[PDB]
Design a protein around this ligand. Sequence first.
Ligand SMILES: CC(C)[C@H](NC(=O)[C@H](Cc1cccc2ccccc12)CS(=O)(=O)C(C)(C)C)C(=O)N[C@H](CO)Cc1ccccc1
Ligand SMILES: CC(C)[C@H](NC(=O)[C@H](Cc1cccc2ccccc12)CS(=O)(=O)C(C)(C)C)C(=O)N[C@H](CO)Cc1ccccc1
Lengths: 104, 104
Amino acid sequence: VTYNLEKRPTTIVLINDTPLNVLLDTGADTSVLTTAHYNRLKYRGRKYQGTGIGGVGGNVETFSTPVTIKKKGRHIKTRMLVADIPVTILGRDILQDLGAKLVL
Amino acid sequence: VTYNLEKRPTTIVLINDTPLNVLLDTGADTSVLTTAHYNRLKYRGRKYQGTGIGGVGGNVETFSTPVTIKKKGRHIKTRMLVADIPVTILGRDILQDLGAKLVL
Ligand SMILES: CC(C)[C@H](NC(=O)[C@H](Cc1cccc2ccccc12)CS(=O)(=O)C(C)(C)C)C(=O)N[C@H](CO)Cc1ccccc1
Ligand SMILES: CC(C)[C@H](NC(=O)[C@H](Cc1cccc2ccccc12)CS(=O)(=O)C(C)(C)C)C(=O)N[C@H](CO)Cc1ccccc1
């Protein structure tokens, strides 16, 4: 499917068997689950201390956690960062895995 | 052209006749010029007080300014926000104007 960017490009993905609405973000080097979403996952793996992410207003602490993502019939097993941010973001690391491309 | 997201999707655009490297960001609702870039423009219009942007670590103050963007043979006349952020971002408002699309 094609997102023409009239609205934020969001989609539903299953993370650790839990349907979540996520933002598809080409400006994020890496993917981040909000802490509220991490707390709602049906299953959670361990939490590994991380060394934060930087954005508009500064740096925010993160922890990483193992996840299984299912979408487009793919099964991706990877680590996602967890942080108190307003929305869960699939950045370039997972977008590349899913085959997403930006066309200009 | 197609960006496969192995690297951040950057491109050179002319803003007020000045070539600048910009990030193409589907997770940004609006476009923002860094203050360092605003200070380097060959021409600048007035500065209109704004009511900030929110991102990862909080809210940051902004001002808006009129700009002419030239790329892909298009001539876009619009307003861009200005803020002390690390990189200049073309968000969805300008990406839509340029015809950019994200394919998943
Ligand atoms: C949501 C998070 C993941 C995302 N950040 C990034 O991807 C950082 C980009 C990043 C951070 C700092 C300086 C940079 C200089 C040039 C290019 C990228 C840069 C990289 S990361 O720190 O998570 C890390 C730890 C992966 C290096 C973000 O908010 N992204 C927003 C929307 O796209 C843009 C933004 C970035 C930095 C400062 C203000 C705005
Ligand atoms: C670079 C700026 C422009 C960009 N922000 C946004 O686009 C905000 C998204 C925005 C802000 C706050 C809550 C939101 C809730 C749901 C969806 C969007 C939301 C909207 S804006 O405030 O500039 C405004 C004033 C246009 C409403 C950003 O940093 N984007 C990064 C990388 O994509 C993501 C991010 C957003 C908020 C908090 C943490 C991370």
